[PDB]
Design a protein around this ligand. Structure first.
Ligand code: CLR
Ligand code: CLR
Ligand code: CLR
Ligand code: OLB
Ligand code: OLC
Ligand code: OLC
Ligand code: OLC
Ligand code: OLC
Ligand code: OLC
Ligand code: OLC
Ligand code: OLC
Ligand code: ZMA
Ligand code: OLA
Ligand code: OLA
Ligand code: OLA
Ligand code: OLA
Ligand code: OLA
Ligand code: NA
Length: 394
């Protein structure tokens, strides 16, 4: 018999509405930017748009649902369940989109030549539709019978004065905690998050290995070259030539590219120097191999810098997207962890109400943050945001 509940409720409702406004506005901007700019119309950003659509729905539907269910109003139990569980559909859809983005970037760095033929917009669209259907089936599974509708709180249902077939609509009274912990958290949230962690680990390892190979081929080119100018035997020169030749066509594997001309001059100049070396013409081999360094300084170095900056851009982009996964875990793990304490420690007092609603608010603010990550970390998004804001506002 303490403070009137409407005072704490007013703070919670006001905060939730403030979050809904920001989740809608920022994510509308993301969709608008992708619609407007053809540089943003790729497969990766179709999952970004699906993720933005889920976050718009958090503000338009899930947050009004959250406000409604906090009152504990009388409702038919299956109507209560849909109000209580709809946010899990949107959260599961976010998981699928984040997982698809990770696999997309993994395919792009592991087999870039085959990427465009394997990962197409038509297949992406079908993957998205399937993930939304599965998200409804996973998120609304309690409506299929795994619920507490058969064991109502009669004390609460008579206090509130509910009618026949009605319950006081409270989350922890209608949704069983073993579904929430075992099915939703462990299987549907925690396992995909660990998979995303593993995929991103593989992305960074593949990039580090591909940059290391590039550097080893480059040093192999210049080491064997320095050995050429120092040798005094015909076969000693031919040995540094054959090892320079393998590294040559090795780096070649890493019609609108004038780069094959650079590698054909290089490999042809090596073979010329090889034929001299086999004929004992040492000094001719050493002089014919000395013109390699201008072919290197006019073609090979230009292509090994361009391949390096492309890999660095893929690493920077993959880090930007991994931040999105980290902030998702940050905002949703407290609620899951609180549920674990409620479920696994019956000797523990229940987490207090103010902490419950702080964790609910925290999970909702995740629907606000992604547009900020795009604006700060991805230039093409930031510049498109700027144009939209300047033009279609001021
Ligand atoms: C905006 C578009 C998607 C329509 C939104 C549908 C929402 C508002 C509708 C669809 C199903 C509806 C629920 C279905 C049944 C019940 C049980 C009843 O005892 C109280 C109302 C309640 C809880 C309804 C509340 C409103 C509801 C959730
Ligand atoms: C993911 C990051 C933010 C870590 C989150 C840590 C939070 C969720 C943890 C840290 C300390 C935890 C609390 C410590 C002890 C209790 C008392 C118990 O009777 C109910 C659970 C409760 C209230 C825990 C709830 C969850 C809790 C608040
Ligand atoms: C980063 C990933 C692994 C997060 C998962 C950590 C979870 C599963 C761990 C972290 C802290 C753990 C809790 C810490 C203490 C207790 C009290 C005990 O009487 C029941 C189990 C319970 C409630 C644990 C359940 C499992 C738990 C919630
Ligand atoms: C769509 C936009 C908003 C959705 C609002 C959610 C609608 C919330 C349902 C309101 C309700 O059930 O009231 C009847 C009570 O008197 C029962 O006791
Ligand atoms: C943003 C910082 C805090 C948000 C505050 C969120 C939690 C504030 C307390 C909410 C609360 O206690 O809710 C009572 C419940 O609605 C029954 O009246
Ligand atoms: C509930 C809200 C759903 C809102 C869904 C909004 C869907 C917008 C999709 C979109 O913007 O698509 C751009 C497209 O890729 C360009 O060809
Ligand atoms: C409201 C919940 C259902 C929202 C359903 C929205 C479908 C997802 C979507 O809009 O996808 C667009 C696609 O990514 C464009 O290429
Ligand atoms: C626009 C929706 C703003 C939030 C609506 C909250 C609401 O409708 O609450 C009804 C309450 O449960 C009745 O007992
Ligand atoms: C893929 C998923 C298909 C989902 C199949 C959905 C099966 C029907 C669900 C249903 O009919 O639920 C009624 C509810 O249990 C009334 O008490
Ligand atoms: C992977 C991360 C966590 C897995 C380990 C989480 C397992 C937590 C088990 C807690 C437990 O078993 O609690 C026993 C208690 O006696 C029941 O009331
Ligand atoms: C993340 C880790 C959260 C776990 C943080 C450490 C949790 C300490 C264990 C605990 O919460 O003990 C409660 C005590 O029994 C009173 O009921
Ligand atoms: N445990 C829980 N409770 C609520 N709302 C009810 C908070 C509450 C708890 C006890 C009480 O007596 C009155 C109200 N929403 C909740 N959402 C979630 C959730 C969604 C996704 C993961 O956890 N868990 N969750
Ligand atoms: C903007 C947020 C303003 C914060 C100012 C006061 C918040 C404190 C009110 C929280 C009351 C908790 C009620 C409860 O325990 O159920
Ligand atoms: C929240 C951050 C986004 C605010 C910018 C307003 C965008 C206007 C709009 O397109 O709806
Ligand atoms: C729409 C604007 C928000 C209206 C305020 C909702 C009040 C919540 C309630 O009725 O308990
Ligand atoms: C436990 C999960 C750790 C959360 C990662 C947050 C780091 C970040 O904000 O990028
Ligand atoms: C936001 C901040 C929430 C702080 C509320 C914690 C104090 C609860 C008041 C009380 O002791 O009953
Ligand atoms: Na989301």
């Amino acid at each position: 018999d303490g403070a009137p509940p409407i005072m704490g409720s007013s703070v919670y409702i006001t905060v939730e509405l403030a979050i809904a406004v920001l989740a809608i506005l920022g994510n509308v901007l993301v969709c608008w930017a992708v619609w407007l700019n053809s540089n943003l119309q790729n497969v990766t950003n179709y999952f970004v748009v699906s993720l933005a659509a889920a976050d718009i729905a958090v503000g338009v539907l899930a947050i009004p649902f959250a406000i409604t269910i906090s009152t504990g109003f009388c409702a038919a139990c299956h109507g209560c369940l849909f109000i209580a569980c709809f946010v899990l559909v949107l959260t599961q859809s976010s998981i699928f989109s984040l997982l698809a983005i990770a696999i997309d970037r993994y395919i792009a760095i592991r087999i870039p030549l085959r990427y465009n033929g394997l990962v197409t917009g038509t297949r992406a669209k079908g993957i998205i539709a399937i993930c939304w259907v599965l998200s409804f089936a996973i998120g609304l599974t309690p409506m299929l019978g795994w619920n507490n509708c058969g064991q109502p709180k009669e004390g609460k249902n008579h206090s509130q004065g509910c009618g026949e077939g009605q319950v006081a609509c409270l989350f922890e009274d209608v949704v069983p905690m073993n579904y929430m912990v075992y099915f939703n958290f462990f299987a549907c949230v925690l396992v995909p998050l660990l998979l995303m962690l593993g995929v991103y680990l593989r992305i960074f390892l593949a990039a580090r290995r591909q940059l290391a190979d590039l550097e080893d081929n480059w040093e192999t080119l210049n080491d064997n070259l320095k050995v050429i100018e120092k040798a005094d035997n015909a076969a000693q020169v031919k040995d540094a030539l054959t090892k320079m030749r393998a590294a040559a066509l090795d780096a070649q594997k890493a019609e609108m590219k004038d780069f094959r001309h650079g590698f054909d001059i290089l490999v042809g100049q090596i073979d010329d120097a090889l034929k001299l070396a086999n004929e004992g013409k040492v000094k001719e081999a050493q002089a014919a191999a000395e013109q390699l360094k201008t072919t290197r300084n006019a073609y090979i170095q230009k292509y090994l810098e361009r391949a390096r900056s492309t890999l660095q851009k893929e690493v920077h982009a993959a880090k930007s997207l991994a931040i999105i996964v980290g902030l998702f875990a940050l905002c949703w793990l407290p609620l899951h962890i609180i549920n674990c304490f409620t479920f696994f420690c019956p000797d523990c007092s229940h987490a207090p109400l103010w902490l419950m609603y702080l964790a609910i608010v925290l999970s909702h603010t995740n629907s606000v943050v992604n547009p900020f990550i795009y604006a700060y970390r991805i230039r093409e998004f930031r510049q498109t945001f700027r144009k939209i804001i300047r033009s279609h506002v001021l």
